[PDB]
Each structure stands twice: as C-alpha cells, then as structure tokens.
Amino acid sequence: MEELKSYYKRVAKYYSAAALLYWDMQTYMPKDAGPYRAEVLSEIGTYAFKQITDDALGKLLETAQPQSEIDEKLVYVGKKEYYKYKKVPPELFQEIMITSTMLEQKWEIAKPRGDFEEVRPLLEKIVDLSRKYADILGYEGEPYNALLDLYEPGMKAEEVDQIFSKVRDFIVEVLEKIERLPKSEDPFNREIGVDKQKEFSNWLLHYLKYDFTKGRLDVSAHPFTNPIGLNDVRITTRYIVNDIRNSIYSTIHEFGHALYALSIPTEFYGLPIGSSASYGFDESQSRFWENVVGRSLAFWKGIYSKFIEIVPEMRGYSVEELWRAVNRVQRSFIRTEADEVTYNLHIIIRFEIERELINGELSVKDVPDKWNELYKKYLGLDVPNNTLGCMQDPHWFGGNFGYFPTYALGNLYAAQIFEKLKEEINFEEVVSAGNFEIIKNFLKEKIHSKGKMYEPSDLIKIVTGKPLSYESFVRYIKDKYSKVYEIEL
Amino acid sequence: MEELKSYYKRVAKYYSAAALLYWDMQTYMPKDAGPYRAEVLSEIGTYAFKQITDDALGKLLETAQPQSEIDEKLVYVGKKEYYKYKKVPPELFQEIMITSTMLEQKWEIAKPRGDFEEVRPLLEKIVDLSRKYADILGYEGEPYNALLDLYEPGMKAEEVDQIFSKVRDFIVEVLEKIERLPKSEDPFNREIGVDKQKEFSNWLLHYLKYDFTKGRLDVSAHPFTNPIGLNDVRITTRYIVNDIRNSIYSTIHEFGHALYALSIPTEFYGLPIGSSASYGFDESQSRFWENVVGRSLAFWKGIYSKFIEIVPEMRGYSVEELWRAVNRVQRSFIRTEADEVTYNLHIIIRFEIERELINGELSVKDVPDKWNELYKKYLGLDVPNNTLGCMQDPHWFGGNFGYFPTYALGNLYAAQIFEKLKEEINFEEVVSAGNFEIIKNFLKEKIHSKGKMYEPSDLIKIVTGKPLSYESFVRYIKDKYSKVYEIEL
Ligand SMILES: [Co+2]
Ligand SMILES: [Co+2]
C-alpha cells in the first residue's frame, strides 16, 4: 500500500530532523543553547511517537493488502511495532522522557566526583518506571526480557546468560596465559599531533572508500554514527594526542556502522524494515570493520607505508610490531578502552546488574557495591571510586536497560559472520590488497540488503547457517591472540 | 493567556528544527543529501504553517484576555497574522512552495550560462501565483503592496517610490563629483591567507563581544545569520583570498543581525512579537554595524594595530589610508559587491522591476531587457550577459517579491538611527575606544527590546521622533564621502 508507505515516510522526516538536532548538539551547538535544544528534541520526538502510535496508522496497517513478499514483511513488522507501542500510556512516555533528561544532566555533574547520591533518586525512579514499562509491554520468562527485546528482538536473557558464561570461562583461561608474559614497550605511547592524526583518519576513510558525498567526519566528545537522512550518514571521532589508536579505531568503528546504514536498500528508507536488524547486528558491523578487519595484520600490511609516511617518528617499527601493538591486552577499569579479549567481561558485569535491577532482585542503592564486587570477580580489579566504577557509562543514566548485552552479541555475531565470509573469500589477500568492495558486497548481499525484514536469530541462520553461539568467537580469539602473543592459546 | 503562549512556543520548536535544517544545509550537509533535506524542510515548514493557521489557534486568539500591555500587543499582532494567513488555501501554499524549490534548483544550473530560457517558464509561473496570492491577501493602492507588506508591514510602494527618487537624484550628483577624481591604488588588492583572515574575523568578533556561548561562526557560499533557537544565533562569512574586506565586512554585517536577534527579550521568544520589527529594521542593524560603525575612521583607529600585526604586509599604510580603502566607490554589475553610495541604485532597479511584474505591467519575458535598460539608465553600465545581469540574485528565483526594497530602507533607517544616537553619545570616542556596550544598550533600549510589538513606521518615530525619510542618509553620505574623497559633497 503506497498510502502506508507515505505515512511512514512522512514520520521519518521528523525523525530526520530529530537526528540532525542530536548530531548538531554533539558537534557544533553553542553551550548555552543546550536546554532549549533539549526541549526542541523532546517535542519533535514526542510528536513522531504520537504519529507512530496513532489510530490512522493502525487503520492503514489493518487495511493494507500486501502485493509482494517485501510488502508482507513491512506490514508484519509494522504491525508488531505498532501494537507494542500503542499500549504505552503517553503519561508513561513523557514521565520516562523527562526523568531521563534530568538523570542525564545530573549525571554529568555528579560523575567527576563519583557522587552516587546526587544521581541515586532519579536512577531508582527510572528503574521503577522501566519495570512498569516492562510489565505493560508483557514478557516471557523475565521482566528484563521485555526491555532486552527492544534492542535485540527475540533474544532472551537466559540464552544471553548461557552464551556469556561460556564466553567468560574461555576469557579467564586466555587472560591467564597472556598475563604471564612480560609486556613489550608500546610503540604508540607517544605524542602525534592532531593534524597528523586527522590526515591519517581522512586517508583511512578514503582507503576504505567512505562515501563523502553521503556523509562527513567531525569530532565529538564520544564517537558515534548518526544516520540523519537519505544519503546523509555522519560519523564522529576523537583525537587523543598521545594515543593515535583512539582516533584510528573510532573512525573505523563508525565507518562500520555508516556502511550498514548506507547499504540498506533505498526503497526501504523511512519504513519499519528500513533500519538495521538489531543493535547486536549493527554493532557486529562496526566491530567487523574496527577489529576483524582493522586490527588484522592483513589490514596493517596495506596501511603501513602510508602510516609510516604520515608518522615518520614510527618508521623504526615493523608492520608486525605495529600490528601487535594495536592488539595489547590489559585489564582496565574503563569499558570503552578495553581490548577485544577483556571487553566482554565488562558487558557481562553490566548484564548481570541491569537484569537484576529490572527483575527487582537488586536495588539501585546496592549498585556501587555490586559493580565493585563484580569488577573484582571477573576482572580482578579493585574499583577505587564511582567515576571509574558504575558511573562511567551514560546508558543507565539515560534510562537504557537491555542495551549493554548487544555490545557483546555484536562481538559474537562479528566472529561468526567472519567465519562464514572466510569460506567464500581469501580474506587476508583481499584485505592486504585494499580491495574492500569484495567484502562490502558480501555484507550487502548477506546482511545490509535485509534491513529489518528478519529477526536477528533468523538473520544469523540465513547468513551463516547456524544460530548465534560463542564457538566462532573462541576460534577467532584463540587463533588471533596465539599469533599476537606467540604462545599456544 | 499562558495557553496562547504555549501554543506559539510549541510551534516555534518546529521553526527551530527548520532553522537548523537550513543552517546545516548551507554549511555541513553532504552533497547528495540535498534533495531529501529539501523534502524534510518542506514537510516541517508546511506542518508549522498548518499549526499557525489552525482553528485551535484562532480559538485561542479569540478567547485570550490580555492582562498587561504586552499581552495586548501579542494578541493584536497574533490576530493580524492569523487572519491574514488563514485565507491561504493550502493548495496555493504547496503550489508556490514546490514551484519555488524547482525555480531555485533550475536557477543554479542556468545561471553560469545566463540561460534565461531554462528558468523563464517557472519564473512566469511563480509571478502568476504571486499575483493571485496578492489578490487573496487584499491590498490598498497596488497589488504589489500586499507582498511588500509581508517584509515591511505598513509600508506602501508609493512612499518607497518617493523616497527612492530623492535618494537616486542625490546619488547621481554625488557619483559625478566622485568619478572626476583619479583613484588611488587599492591597498587591500593583495593575497592574504585564509588562516590570517580567520584569525582577524575571530579577533573582530571578540572585540565586538559576539557571545560565543550563544552562537558561532562558520563559512558558507553566501554569508547569513540564522537565529536557530533560544541562545543559538549563528553567523557565516566567506573568505576571499585577494579581498580580506569581504570576510571582514560580511562577519560584521552578520554580527549586526545576530545582536538584534539575541537582544530581543527572552520572554518574547517563540511569540509573534518575538522577531525583528521588519526586514528593513533587521537590515538597518546589520548595516549600522557593518558600515556606520565598521567603515568609520573611528572604528579603524581601534582595530588598526591589531590588523597590522595580523597582516604585517600592510604595515606601510596609515589608518587613514586603510579607512578610505574600505570606502572605495565604484559602479559595478554586482549588488552584493556595491559600495554604500551606489548600492541603493541596485535596489531601485529591482524595486521598479518586481513592482511592475506583480502589478502585471511587465512580463517575465521582458525582464532581461528591462534590467539591462535600467542598469544603463541608473548605473551607466552595459550589461553583457544575464549572469552579471538579472540572474545574479536568488530572490526572484525563490519567489520572494517585496523583499528587495527593504535592503534600501535598511540603509535609510540606519542613517536616521545613527543621527539620533549621535545626540546622546560621543560616537567617535566610544567607537575608537572599543566601548560598544554603550551603543548596544542604546540599540537594545530603543529598538531590540521592542521586538515586533510595533509596526516600523511607529517604531522609527518612537526611536527618532520622525517618520523615515532620506535626509539622514543624505547628511550621512555628504559628510562621510566628503571626508573620504577630500572634496566638497
Ligand atoms: Co558502535
Ligand atoms: Co543582511
């Protein structure tokens, strides 16, 4: 039904405006403009929501007569989203929405001082609303499964728990072998001017063939990807003078997200089937490019001579030394700084906590002690204060629960996708040659072209023939880190 | 009525989004994003219009009971705007809106080739709609008076004609005395790197105390000022390597607009009384700062040492030489490049043409010949082609008629405002000292604080005690250009 399509395409225009408003907020917006910008965003978002849970859309959904298979998926997906969100009493939406912004802005102030008490009351409030929200969305097995479903449709906390446990056991085994070894000096531990870093990030984006007719690179406090409109998908990075790896891998990570957004069929734009399949799947794409491609020796062989030219200071290092040095493993307090071996331990910890929070088995008051205890259990670290501890990430302070686990699933999806890719393609030759269109074409045909037509579990089977599990990841880490650290396992 | 205020403040949020969408379009937007951005903008604009011509607002306007004098003005102004635009059949709005964008985009292509025929059909169409638009808005004296009223409320074409004639006569007299003199070499006719130009524009903005917590400077193809939101008023400039005066005076011109927007009372934000009084009044503010302040010897005395430091190449010039050189008079094809003596001749020519167009006394087909004839009559120039001729400006190709004359009125207002300011203030001492808050305070108390509470004719009397006329301008030009060129008159 053309009429159904138009209704969605009209609402998407308001989403586009909201997306630009968010992008500008993080990049160019003047300081004092913040509070009003927040009000504009809230207004536009709430209007878009009204439109998307309105009777006229339900009426269109119930009257449309699909002609093709794609039309069927559209209504199917359209219906499921509509009836789920119809159930949301506009009171609860606005009550969460304002509580979020207020928790968000309070967190900014309290975080440098690890002052949990300044954010505690709003956090225990947002968790309460979430639990009510979860009740009136309905759930199988666990209240938490309701919220998890919003980010990873069809995924259950019990399966996540089973995969996480196996993943954890393998990671402690690996960590223990790696930790025995003396570390080498870090060749990237040195000052490289921002201008040189920008030059290299821009070179990388051209080498990867980022479409600068349909996006751009800017800086923000926290690197992200923002699909603003048709042919407008923007990415940000951050330049840390004494660790060029931050800008390099942020840029490539965001390229990964951007490529996904740009490669979804144009005809899907603005439609319910027009986004990525899930947060896990979107993160599988950023991680694929950032880590599987970006931290591979094959990738480095191709960028080495250009890097060396731009950064003559590091001429004295071999490509193999540089490759190993972007793969340094280290238990650290900060999730966003974690290597691909320790990273998932950070997600497990957050998974355990937010699940118990939403299932009413843990209080907000006990969060700091619980966080610290789990960092001690899984990462063997003594969290000194809350800044490095439980207030380090914004997610919870924006009210997002069920989001965190999808970062880990993203790592798992990426490894399994990569194992499949390797059956059809000489990955090392392709990547060291810089011939990425071969890889892009595989990802488009297998993944990007499907948009949100399928739930992730179905999508992973279509792509790889198997449900998601940890074996691909285990194999990926065993093989790679054995080569990195020159030891068995 | 708080309820009336809220309704407007809600619509203003959509205006805010539209404003950001326009700003980004001109600054950061990737090339291929254009067509969809145009669709988002159109959608949001049309929704905002619906809201502002909707029965619920009429009902609020007719039921509100003003408590204070400001409330009265609000409803008064609110009513006049509402009933005027209610009369607009949504067909006519969208029909003009799309015709505009299509005329706009065609013009871009045809302009480099002066191909009038590629734009002719859409232009004759947009003029026809305009004439219908003018009929169903209603008018006194002239159909053109309807459109003129949208940019300069209460102004009639007959008064504009009378002022323009006197202004023209004085200008040819002045031009003739100036043209007899041999020109000196132009000290600014040299390459100055963009980095140095940026440094100076940023210095200027700090010297003028642009509030960078509530705005920012960027570049675009065509310098402008965009009030995006509360505490968010942005300006753009353009750097021409071989004429630093372009960036200097663009920056200061836009500062002038920005200051006006920022100084309207916060309580008026989002309300009908919350904008500038008219286009003429807004342009009087940009011109005041750009020319009356910016091209004065007094201003130059204060910026001289800083300029000289930034541009050591021009150390060999005296401040008086630099001052004269930003005041070089020259008949030229291009309106945006015209000095303050010849500039208004460009506006007269456009006034005469669009008035006759809208009053049905001139066809679109005859525009090129008419333009060329009037450039010959008033500026003594032989227009070689349409690129330098009638297709040089975008206004008509965006459907804006009645806009052009307000540029000239802006010059007239500025001179009269300046004559009044001089009765209360030692302008030269204040300006050469860099003590601009004295001037800002006068402009705020007299002008900016009034927003759109008053029609321009009433506002100019309040500010200066007289209706608008050309005498202040005549006096301003006689006195200044006599000093610049060292001759009588
Ligand atoms: Co990501
Ligand atoms: Co202006």
PDB file of N, CA and C in Angstrom, chain B residues 283-353:
ATOM      1  N   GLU B 283      17.728  44.770   8.599  1.00  0.00           N
ATOM      2  CA  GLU B 283      18.857  45.202   7.764  1.00  0.00           C
ATOM      3  C   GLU B 283      19.491  46.530   8.236  1.00  0.00           C
ATOM      4  N   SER B 284      18.713  47.371   8.925  1.00  0.00           N
ATOM      5  CA  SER B 284      19.270  48.600   9.497  1.00  0.00           C
ATOM      6  C   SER B 284      20.317  48.272  10.552  1.00  0.00           C
ATOM      7  N   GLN B 285      20.126  47.141  11.229  1.00  0.00           N
ATOM      8  CA  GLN B 285      21.041  46.717  12.285  1.00  0.00           C
ATOM      9  C   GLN B 285      22.339  46.139  11.723  1.00  0.00           C
ATOM     10  N   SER B 286      22.234  45.282  10.716  1.00  0.00           N
ATOM     11  CA  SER B 286      23.426  44.797  10.036  1.00  0.00           C
ATOM     12  C   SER B 286      24.209  45.944   9.372  1.00  0.00           C
ATOM     13  N   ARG B 287      23.499  46.842   8.706  1.00  0.00           N
ATOM     14  CA  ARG B 287      24.166  47.959   8.061  1.00  0.00           C
ATOM     15  C   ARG B 287      24.774  48.936   9.058  1.00  0.00           C
ATOM     16  N   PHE B 288      24.095  49.145  10.189  1.00  0.00           N
ATOM     17  CA  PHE B 288      24.624  50.017  11.228  1.00  0.00           C
ATOM     18  C   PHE B 288      26.005  49.539  11.641  1.00  0.00           C
ATOM     19  N   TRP B 289      26.099  48.251  11.951  1.00  0.00           N
ATOM     20  CA  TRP B 289      27.357  47.712  12.422  1.00  0.00           C
ATOM     21  C   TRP B 289      28.361  47.615  11.283  1.00  0.00           C
ATOM     22  N   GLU B 290      27.928  47.095  10.143  1.00  0.00           N
ATOM     23  CA  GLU B 290      28.861  46.877   9.033  1.00  0.00           C
ATOM     24  C   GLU B 290      29.463  48.181   8.528  1.00  0.00           C
ATOM     25  N   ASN B 291      28.594  49.151   8.245  1.00  0.00           N
ATOM     26  CA  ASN B 291      29.005  50.382   7.571  1.00  0.00           C
ATOM     27  C   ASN B 291      29.185  51.584   8.492  1.00  0.00           C
ATOM     28  N   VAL B 292      28.135  51.967   9.213  1.00  0.00           N
ATOM     29  CA  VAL B 292      28.197  53.150  10.080  1.00  0.00           C
ATOM     30  C   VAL B 292      29.277  52.982  11.151  1.00  0.00           C
ATOM     31  N   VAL B 293      29.310  51.825  11.802  1.00  0.00           N
ATOM     32  CA  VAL B 293      30.419  51.566  12.684  1.00  0.00           C
ATOM     33  C   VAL B 293      31.623  51.040  11.897  1.00  0.00           C
ATOM     34  N   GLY B 294      31.451  49.932  11.188  1.00  0.00           N
ATOM     35  CA  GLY B 294      32.577  49.208  10.616  1.00  0.00           C
ATOM     36  C   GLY B 294      33.423  49.938   9.587  1.00  0.00           C
ATOM     37  N   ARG B 295      32.829  50.850   8.824  1.00  0.00           N
ATOM     38  CA  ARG B 295      33.619  51.578   7.820  1.00  0.00           C
ATOM     39  C   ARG B 295      33.940  53.008   8.246  1.00  0.00           C
ATOM     40  N   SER B 296      33.859  53.275   9.555  1.00  0.00           N
ATOM     41  CA  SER B 296      34.155  54.597  10.086  1.00  0.00           C
ATOM     42  C   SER B 296      35.631  54.650  10.442  1.00  0.00           C
ATOM     43  N   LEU B 297      36.195  55.842  10.364  1.00  0.00           N
ATOM     44  CA  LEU B 297      37.584  56.055  10.738  1.00  0.00           C
ATOM     45  C   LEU B 297      37.745  55.697  12.213  1.00  0.00           C
ATOM     46  N   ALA B 298      36.782  56.122  13.026  1.00  0.00           N
ATOM     47  CA  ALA B 298      36.792  55.823  14.467  1.00  0.00           C
ATOM     48  C   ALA B 298      36.954  54.331  14.756  1.00  0.00           C
ATOM     49  N   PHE B 299      36.218  53.495  14.024  1.00  0.00           N
ATOM     50  CA  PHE B 299      36.339  52.048  14.219  1.00  0.00           C
ATOM     51  C   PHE B 299      37.727  51.607  13.822  1.00  0.00           C
ATOM     52  N   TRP B 300      38.187  52.075  12.669  1.00  0.00           N
ATOM     53  CA  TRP B 300      39.508  51.669  12.188  1.00  0.00           C
ATOM     54  C   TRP B 300      40.647  52.064  13.118  1.00  0.00           C
ATOM     55  N   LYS B 301      40.569  53.246  13.726  1.00  0.00           N
ATOM     56  CA  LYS B 301      41.615  53.639  14.666  1.00  0.00           C
ATOM     57  C   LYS B 301      41.799  52.590  15.765  1.00  0.00           C
ATOM     58  N   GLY B 302      40.707  51.953  16.175  1.00  0.00           N
ATOM     59  CA  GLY B 302      40.792  50.984  17.255  1.00  0.00           C
ATOM     60  C   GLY B 302      41.258  49.598  16.842  1.00  0.00           C
ATOM     61  N   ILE B 303      41.089  49.247  15.569  1.00  0.00           N
ATOM     62  CA  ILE B 303      41.432  47.899  15.110  1.00  0.00           C
ATOM     63  C   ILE B 303      42.751  47.911  14.356  1.00  0.00           C
ATOM     64  N   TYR B 304      43.285  49.103  14.135  1.00  0.00           N
ATOM     65  CA  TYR B 304      44.420  49.268  13.236  1.00  0.00           C
ATOM     66  C   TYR B 304      45.627  48.470  13.677  1.00  0.00           C
ATOM     67  N   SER B 305      46.037  48.656  14.924  1.00  0.00           N
ATOM     68  CA  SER B 305      47.238  47.996  15.406  1.00  0.00           C
ATOM     69  C   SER B 305      47.087  46.487  15.385  1.00  0.00           C
ATOM     70  N   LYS B 306      45.887  45.991  15.666  1.00  0.00           N
ATOM     71  CA  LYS B 306      45.697  44.541  15.632  1.00  0.00           C
ATOM     72  C   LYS B 306      45.746  44.022  14.204  1.00  0.00           C
ATOM     73  N   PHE B 307      45.131  44.762  13.280  1.00  0.00           N
ATOM     74  CA  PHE B 307      45.106  44.367  11.874  1.00  0.00           C
ATOM     75  C   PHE B 307      46.511  44.296  11.307  1.00  0.00           C
ATOM     76  N   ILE B 308      47.272  45.343  11.592  1.00  0.00           N
ATOM     77  CA  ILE B 308      48.650  45.494  11.153  1.00  0.00           C
ATOM     78  C   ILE B 308      49.520  44.359  11.659  1.00  0.00           C
ATOM     79  N   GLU B 309      49.290  43.939  12.899  1.00  0.00           N
ATOM     80  CA  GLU B 309      50.034  42.818  13.450  1.00  0.00           C
ATOM     81  C   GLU B 309      49.719  41.531  12.696  1.00  0.00           C
ATOM     82  N   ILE B 310      48.430  41.262  12.528  1.00  0.00           N
ATOM     83  CA  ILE B 310      47.987  40.072  11.821  1.00  0.00           C
ATOM     84  C   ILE B 310      48.420  40.094  10.360  1.00  0.00           C
ATOM     85  N   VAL B 311      48.353  41.262   9.736  1.00  0.00           N
ATOM     86  CA  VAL B 311      48.730  41.392   8.332  1.00  0.00           C
ATOM     87  C   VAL B 311      49.926  42.330   8.184  1.00  0.00           C
ATOM     88  N   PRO B 312      51.132  41.853   8.544  1.00  0.00           N
ATOM     89  CA  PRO B 312      52.301  42.741   8.507  1.00  0.00           C
ATOM     90  C   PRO B 312      52.545  43.333   7.125  1.00  0.00           C
ATOM     91  N   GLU B 313      52.099  42.640   6.075  1.00  0.00           N
ATOM     92  CA  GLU B 313      52.219  43.122   4.692  1.00  0.00           C
ATOM     93  C   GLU B 313      51.708  44.549   4.528  1.00  0.00           C
ATOM     94  N   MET B 314      50.702  44.915   5.319  1.00  0.00           N
ATOM     95  CA  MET B 314      50.080  46.223   5.167  1.00  0.00           C
ATOM     96  C   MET B 314      50.474  47.255   6.233  1.00  0.00           C
ATOM     97  N   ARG B 315      51.565  46.966   6.931  1.00  0.00           N
ATOM     98  CA  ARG B 315      52.170  47.885   7.886  1.00  0.00           C
ATOM     99  C   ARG B 315      52.439  49.274   7.280  1.00  0.00           C
ATOM    100  N   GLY B 316      52.716  49.332   5.986  1.00  0.00           N
ATOM    101  CA  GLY B 316      53.150  50.584   5.387  1.00  0.00           C
ATOM    102  C   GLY B 316      52.025  51.561   5.117  1.00  0.00           C
ATOM    103  N   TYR B 317      50.823  51.198   5.522  1.00  0.00           N
ATOM    104  CA  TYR B 317      49.697  52.053   5.248  1.00  0.00           C
ATOM    105  C   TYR B 317      49.277  52.744   6.528  1.00  0.00           C
ATOM    106  N   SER B 318      48.772  53.967   6.414  1.00  0.00           N
ATOM    107  CA  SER B 318      48.273  54.660   7.586  1.00  0.00           C
ATOM    108  C   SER B 318      46.837  54.220   7.840  1.00  0.00           C
ATOM    109  N   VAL B 319      46.351  54.447   9.053  1.00  0.00           N
ATOM    110  CA  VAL B 319      44.966  54.107   9.347  1.00  0.00           C
ATOM    111  C   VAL B 319      44.009  54.870   8.428  1.00  0.00           C
ATOM    112  N   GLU B 320      44.353  56.109   8.100  1.00  0.00           N
ATOM    113  CA  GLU B 320      43.507  56.908   7.217  1.00  0.00           C
ATOM    114  C   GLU B 320      43.451  56.337   5.795  1.00  0.00           C
ATOM    115  N   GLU B 321      44.567  55.793   5.327  1.00  0.00           N
ATOM    116  CA  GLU B 321      44.580  55.121   4.030  1.00  0.00           C
ATOM    117  C   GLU B 321      43.723  53.857   4.038  1.00  0.00           C
ATOM    118  N   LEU B 322      43.790  53.104   5.131  1.00  0.00           N
ATOM    119  CA  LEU B 322      43.026  51.878   5.229  1.00  0.00           C
ATOM    120  C   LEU B 322      41.550  52.226   5.291  1.00  0.00           C
ATOM    121  N   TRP B 323      41.216  53.252   6.070  1.00  0.00           N
ATOM    122  CA  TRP B 323      39.841  53.694   6.217  1.00  0.00           C
ATOM    123  C   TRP B 323      39.226  54.089   4.880  1.00  0.00           C
ATOM    124  N   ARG B 324      39.963  54.878   4.097  1.00  0.00           N
ATOM    125  CA  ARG B 324      39.485  55.303   2.780  1.00  0.00           C
ATOM    126  C   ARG B 324      39.279  54.119   1.846  1.00  0.00           C
ATOM    127  N   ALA B 325      40.198  53.161   1.921  1.00  0.00           N
ATOM    128  CA  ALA B 325      40.185  51.984   1.064  1.00  0.00           C
ATOM    129  C   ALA B 325      39.053  50.988   1.355  1.00  0.00           C
ATOM    130  N   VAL B 326      38.388  51.098   2.501  1.00  0.00           N
ATOM    131  CA  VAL B 326      37.199  50.256   2.715  1.00  0.00           C
ATOM    132  C   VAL B 326      35.982  51.045   2.309  1.00  0.00           C
ATOM    133  N   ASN B 327      36.225  52.236   1.775  1.00  0.00           N
ATOM    134  CA  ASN B 327      35.159  53.124   1.322  1.00  0.00           C
ATOM    135  C   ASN B 327      35.316  53.568  -0.130  1.00  0.00           C
ATOM    136  N   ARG B 328      35.821  52.664  -0.967  1.00  0.00           N
ATOM    137  CA  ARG B 328      36.028  52.950  -2.379  1.00  0.00           C
ATOM    138  C   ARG B 328      34.712  52.864  -3.126  1.00  0.00           C
ATOM    139  N   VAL B 329      34.396  53.894  -3.897  1.00  0.00           N
ATOM    140  CA  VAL B 329      33.151  53.944  -4.640  1.00  0.00           C
ATOM    141  C   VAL B 329      33.410  53.540  -6.095  1.00  0.00           C
ATOM    142  N   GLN B 330      32.484  52.771  -6.666  1.00  0.00           N
ATOM    143  CA  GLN B 330      32.674  52.199  -7.995  1.00  0.00           C
ATOM    144  C   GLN B 330      31.352  51.636  -8.491  1.00  0.00           C
ATOM    145  N   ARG B 331      30.947  52.020  -9.688  1.00  0.00           N
ATOM    146  CA  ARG B 331      29.778  51.419 -10.288  1.00  0.00           C
ATOM    147  C   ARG B 331      30.182  50.042 -10.777  1.00  0.00           C
ATOM    148  N   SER B 332      29.414  49.038 -10.385  1.00  0.00           N
ATOM    149  CA  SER B 332      29.746  47.644 -10.651  1.00  0.00           C
ATOM    150  C   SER B 332      28.452  46.897 -10.986  1.00  0.00           C
ATOM    151  N   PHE B 333      28.579  45.771 -11.683  1.00  0.00           N
ATOM    152  CA  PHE B 333      27.417  44.973 -12.061  1.00  0.00           C
ATOM    153  C   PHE B 333      26.712  44.324 -10.875  1.00  0.00           C
ATOM    154  N   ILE B 334      27.484  43.982  -9.849  1.00  0.00           N
ATOM    155  CA  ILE B 334      27.010  43.093  -8.780  1.00  0.00           C
ATOM    156  C   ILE B 334      26.555  43.784  -7.489  1.00  0.00           C
ATOM    157  N   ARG B 335      25.274  43.627  -7.158  1.00  0.00           N
ATOM    158  CA  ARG B 335      24.690  44.285  -5.980  1.00  0.00           C
ATOM    159  C   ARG B 335      25.406  44.010  -4.655  1.00  0.00           C
ATOM    160  N   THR B 336      25.694  42.741  -4.375  1.00  0.00           N
ATOM    161  CA  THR B 336      26.345  42.382  -3.117  1.00  0.00           C
ATOM    162  C   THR B 336      27.766  42.946  -2.987  1.00  0.00           C
ATOM    163  N   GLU B 337      28.367  43.319  -4.106  1.00  0.00           N
ATOM    164  CA  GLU B 337      29.686  43.944  -4.082  1.00  0.00           C
ATOM    165  C   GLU B 337      29.660  45.479  -4.049  1.00  0.00           C
ATOM    166  N   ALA B 338      28.475  46.090  -4.053  1.00  0.00           N
ATOM    167  CA  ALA B 338      28.375  47.547  -4.187  1.00  0.00           C
ATOM    168  C   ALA B 338      28.644  48.328  -2.911  1.00  0.00           C
ATOM    169  N   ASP B 339      29.398  49.408  -3.068  1.00  0.00           N
ATOM    170  CA  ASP B 339      29.707  50.368  -2.016  1.00  0.00           C
ATOM    171  C   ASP B 339      28.425  51.061  -1.565  1.00  0.00           C
ATOM    172  N   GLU B 340      28.478  51.757  -0.436  1.00  0.00           N
ATOM    173  CA  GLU B 340      27.242  52.297   0.132  1.00  0.00           C
ATOM    174  C   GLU B 340      26.684  53.516  -0.619  1.00  0.00           C
ATOM    175  N   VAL B 341      27.448  54.052  -1.562  1.00  0.00           N
ATOM    176  CA  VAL B 341      26.920  55.107  -2.422  1.00  0.00           C
ATOM    177  C   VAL B 341      26.123  54.542  -3.607  1.00  0.00           C
ATOM    178  N   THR B 342      26.684  53.571  -4.319  1.00  0.00           N
ATOM    179  CA  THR B 342      25.991  53.021  -5.486  1.00  0.00           C
ATOM    180  C   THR B 342      24.937  51.966  -5.136  1.00  0.00           C
ATOM    181  N   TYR B 343      25.053  51.378  -3.943  1.00  0.00           N
ATOM    182  CA  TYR B 343      24.250  50.212  -3.561  1.00  0.00           C
ATOM    183  C   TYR B 343      22.761  50.415  -3.776  1.00  0.00           C
ATOM    184  N   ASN B 344      22.230  51.525  -3.292  1.00  0.00           N
ATOM    185  CA  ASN B 344      20.789  51.725  -3.406  1.00  0.00           C
ATOM    186  C   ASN B 344      20.261  51.830  -4.839  1.00  0.00           C
ATOM    187  N   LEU B 345      21.119  52.209  -5.789  1.00  0.00           N
ATOM    188  CA  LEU B 345      20.717  52.203  -7.207  1.00  0.00           C
ATOM    189  C   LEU B 345      20.354  50.786  -7.650  1.00  0.00           C
ATOM    190  N   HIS B 346      21.110  49.802  -7.164  1.00  0.00           N
ATOM    191  CA  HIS B 346      20.801  48.404  -7.448  1.00  0.00           C
ATOM    192  C   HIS B 346      19.426  48.019  -6.939  1.00  0.00           C
ATOM    193  N   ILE B 347      19.067  48.510  -5.752  1.00  0.00           N
ATOM    194  CA  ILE B 347      17.764  48.175  -5.147  1.00  0.00           C
ATOM    195  C   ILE B 347      16.609  48.851  -5.899  1.00  0.00           C
ATOM    196  N   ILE B 348      16.778  50.125  -6.236  1.00  0.00           N
ATOM    197  CA  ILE B 348      15.795  50.852  -7.047  1.00  0.00           C
ATOM    198  C   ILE B 348      15.445  50.070  -8.316  1.00  0.00           C
ATOM    199  N   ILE B 349      16.475  49.676  -9.059  1.00  0.00           N
ATOM    200  CA  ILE B 349      16.283  48.885 -10.267  1.00  0.00           C
ATOM    201  C   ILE B 349      15.441  47.645  -9.999  1.00  0.00           C
ATOM    202  N   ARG B 350      15.729  46.934  -8.909  1.00  0.00           N
ATOM    203  CA  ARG B 350      14.973  45.711  -8.610  1.00  0.00           C
ATOM    204  C   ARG B 350      13.556  46.041  -8.141  1.00  0.00           C
ATOM    205  N   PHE B 351      13.421  47.132  -7.386  1.00  0.00           N
ATOM    206  CA  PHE B 351      12.115  47.649  -6.957  1.00  0.00           C
ATOM    207  C   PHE B 351      11.212  47.898  -8.139  1.00  0.00           C
ATOM    208  N   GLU B 352      11.677  48.735  -9.068  1.00  0.00           N
ATOM    209  CA  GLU B 352      10.906  49.081 -10.269  1.00  0.00           C
ATOM    210  C   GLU B 352      10.431  47.849 -11.006  1.00  0.00           C
ATOM    211  N   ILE B 353      11.331  46.892 -11.197  1.00  0.00           N
ATOM    212  CA  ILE B 353      11.025  45.668 -11.943  1.00  0.00           C
ATOM    213  C   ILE B 353       9.995  44.744 -11.270  1.00  0.00           C
TER     214      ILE B 353
END
